[PDB]
From TrEMBL, chain A:
The chain holds residues 752 to 851 of 901 of the full protein. Signal peptide: none annotated. This is VP3. It is found in: Virion.
Amino acid sequence: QANMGQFRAALRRIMDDDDWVRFGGVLRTVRVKFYDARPPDDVLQGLPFSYDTNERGGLAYATIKYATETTIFYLIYNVEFSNTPDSLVLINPTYTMTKV
Amino acid sequence: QRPERIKTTPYLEGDVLSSDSGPLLSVFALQEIMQKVRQVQADYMTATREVDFTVPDVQKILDDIKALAAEQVYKIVKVPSISFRHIVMQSRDRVLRVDTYYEEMSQVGDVITEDEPEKFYSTIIKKVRFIRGKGSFILHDIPTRDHRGMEVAEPEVLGVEFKNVLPVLTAEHRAMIQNALDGSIIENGNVATRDVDVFIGACSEPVYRIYNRLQGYIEAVQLQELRNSIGWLERLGHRKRITYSQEVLTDFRRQDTIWVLALQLPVNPQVVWDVPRSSIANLIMNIATCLPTGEYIAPNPRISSITLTQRITTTGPFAILTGSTPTAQQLNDVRKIYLALMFPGQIILDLKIDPGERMDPAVRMVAGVVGHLLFTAGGRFTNLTQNMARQLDIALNDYLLYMYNTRVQVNYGPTGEPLDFQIGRNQYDCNVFRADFATGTGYNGWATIDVEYREPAPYVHAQRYIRYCGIDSRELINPTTYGIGMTYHCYNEMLRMLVAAGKDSEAAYFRSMLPFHMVRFARINQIINEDLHSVFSLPDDMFNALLPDLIAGAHQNADPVVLDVSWISLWFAFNRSFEPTHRNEMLEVAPLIESVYASELSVMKVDMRHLSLMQRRFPDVLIQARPSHFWKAVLNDSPEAVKAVMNLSHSHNFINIRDMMRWVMLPSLQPSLKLALEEEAWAAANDFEDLMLTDQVYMHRDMLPEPRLDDIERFRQEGFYYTNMLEAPPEIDRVVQYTYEIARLQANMGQFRAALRRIMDDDDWVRFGGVLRTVRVKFYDARPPDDVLQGLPFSYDTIKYATETTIFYLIYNVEFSNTPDSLVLINPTYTMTKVFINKRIVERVRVGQILAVLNRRFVAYKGKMRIMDITQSLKMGTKLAAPTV
C-alpha cells in the first residue's frame, strides 16, 4: 500500500468505518499506569507504528516500523462541589486509540 | 550475529596465527605466476621475443573501471548546431546554399594512402566516432516568442544561418522572408499543462538518425527495466546472504523528472569468457572482487595432550612438528595451498625442490599421510598434478614400511609399484591408496559425491555446488550424527590402515583431529558456494572438461596454473583453519563493474567486426593488410582500464590472427546505450559518400569559361560561377575504364602518358575507379593557383594511384570599369579533374527557397523538467516495496 501510496488513506477509511486493526503478531511488553487527571497526548493519541519517506538521488524510499511496547492506563475522575452539570461536556470529543 | 559462528564448547577455540585477504592474494598470485616464468627463462637458453613480465596494480585498475561508469555519452543544449549556411554573391536574388556537415566531415581524419592500412582503419574509426559524437544531444528550454496569439520559435534555434542575406534583399523579399519565419509555430502552444516543445527545424540526415535513436531510447527505457535490474540484484543478494536495511524502494515518480539508465545489469557470461587467453585474468579478478577477509586459527592445545596430575602428562606423537614455526617462504606455500583449495581445477600444485634445504626425513613421511587426507585427486576434478600424486604415494609407502616399534608381517605383491603389499595381522590391502585419476581412490574424492546441482543459480553459466568431503555447510547449524559420528570414507580407511600397521598414537591423534578437519572443509565449502559466485567463475562445461583433458594430455583453452610447495607446508596447512571475519569491500559494487566491462568489450567487438569487411569491399586499397592492423587501430581508441583488464597476464603479446578472427565472428554481445548509438553510427557510415570518400573521379579536357560583359548589372544578377562538380556521370559510350594494375603496368612500361594523351585528343573520359579517395572542398572569389586547376588524379614517385582531389567553386566578380571583352585571352586555360558525389553539398537557390530546409521535427523538454542519471543506483543491498516475479 505504500508502494501504491494508499497506506494512510486505507487506515483512515478503516478508522472511519468503526473497525479494528491489528499490526502483526509479535509479543508486546505491557506497562500499567495510573492517572487522576487528563493524560499526556503520548498515551492518548500515540500511534502503534511509524511511517517515513525520503527522496534520494531521484528515487523515493519508505520505512515502516511497529512498536514493541504498549501501555494500560486507569483514569480516575475527581470533581469538586463548584462544578456545573455540564462542566465536563465538550463540543468535540477527545480521541484515544489503544485497546489491550 | 551469524549462527554459523556461534560456539558453545571450547573445542573450536584457537589462537590467531595470521590473517589474509583478497586484494593481497590477487597480487600474490600474479607475482608467483610471473616469478616462475622469469626464473625458468633465466636458467635455460631461450629463443623468443622480448616480453617484460611485470605485475600491475589491481586496485587502481578496479578504481578506474568504477570511474568509467560515471561518464555520459550525451549532452544537454538549448539550441542545435547550424547545418546550413549561405554565401552571398553579387546577385540580389540568387545565393549559394552550403551543407556544413560535409564541410566539417571532409576535414576529419588523415589522408588515405594505399601503403598504410592501419592509418586507413584509424581514419575510418575517427570518422565514425565523429558521427556518433555530433548527434548525441538533448534539447532543453528552447527560446520562444509570442506572435498574434500563439507561440513561435526564435530564428536562432531553427538550425540555419541566413542573417548575412537580409541587407541586400528588396522590401518584398524581406517581407516574404519575415512571414515565412513567423510561420514556424510551436505545436499546441496554448495548452497550459504542456510538457514538451515541438517545432520544425533543419538538420543533416546522419545527425538526425542519432538524435531519433537517443530520443527513442530515452522514451522506452524506464521504471520496468530498473525494477528488473533491482530484482536480479535481490536474487543475487539472497544467494550471497547479505543483510538489508529497513527502508525499501517505492515506484513513485515525480512529474518533473526524466530518468536516464544506460546499463542493464544482468550480464551475459559468454561475452566475458569469449576473450582469448583470458582465464588467468578472470581468475585474478574473481580473487580481487569476491574473496572475503579472515584469520587463520590453530587447533586447541588440549586435543593433543592431557594432564592428569601436576607432573603427569601424556606425550604427543608429533611434538617436534607441533612446536615448529613457519618461515616466510613456508607461509607463502601455505597461502598457495589454500588458494589451490578455494579454486578447484583452476589451480593445481606440484613439488618444489631445493637442494640447499636440509630437513629431517620424517617430515616427508608425515606429509605423505597428510596429503592423502588434504587433497582430491580425481573423479570429477583434481587439486594436484600426477607427478605430485606419485611423490605422495611414494612418501606414504616409505612411512608405512618404517617400523620404529616392533615389526609386523608384510606380504609383497609381484608388481614393483608403491603400496603393493598387505600389512598387519588382518592383512589390510594398501593397493587402494595408490592414485588413479579416473576413479579418485585413495584421496578425498574416494566414493564421495563432490559436485551437486540444485535450484538455478543467479549466474546462468555456473550452476555447480562443491561439497568437499561430502559435508554440507548446513551441518554446522543442523547436524546429522552425534559428535563421534562425523566421518567420511577416505579418513576412515586411513585410520584402519594406520591401526593395522602398528601405529596407534598417530591414529589416535587423527581420530581426535577429525572434527576440526571436517569443520574446516565445511567453511571452505561455504566460502566457495556463497562468496565466490560471479561472472568470473569458470563455466560448467570447461570445469567438467578440465580433468579428462589433463588425463589425456590434450590441448586446453583453460590450462590450469601450477604452483610449487614444500613438504613441511603440508603439515603447516593441515594444522590451520581459515575463518572469514569481514566481507569484501567491493562485493556490493561488483556487478556494475562487470556490466561496464562487458559493454565496452561489446562495443570493441562491433567496431572490429565492421572493419573486417573492408578488404573484401575494396581490395585495391588494402593490398598489404592484416587483421592485426584493424585490431591495433581499434585498441588505440579504447578506454585504458579495459585494455589493462584484458592484458593482466600479458596475453596481448601472444595471440595470433586466427584468435583475432575467431573472436570477431562470435555472436554474443551485451546491450547498452553506447552500443546502440555506435551501431546507428555504423549504419549511417555504411554509405561511403557520407564519409567524404569516393572513387568516381574522372578526367576530361575543359577550358575555363570567358563570358562577355555586354551588360554589367544583368551579368551580376545571374550569379555566374564555375565548378568541377558533376551533375550526372558521363555517358558509358565515351568513358575508358582504368584499374590500378593496368595503369601501373603501363606506367612501368613507360607508355601511360601517350595513352592518356591519345584519349584526351578524342574528347573522351577516363575513370580511375577501384580505390577510395580523400575529397576536400574550396571556394574562390578569384583565379585559383595552378596547383588545383592542373591537379592530376595521380602522381609520379612508378606512380601513386590515389591523391586527394579538391572540388572547387569559382565565383566571378566584375566591376563597372570592365571592358566588354576584358576576360578574353588569346589561349585557353585547361582543367582536367571532375568528381561525382551524388549529394547536394552546394546548390544555387533563389531567395524564395531560403527556408525550404526546415523539414525535421524536434521535441524539446521545458525548463521545469529535470534530467537525472540513475545508473549509479545499481547496488546490491536495496529492497523493493513490491518484489518482481
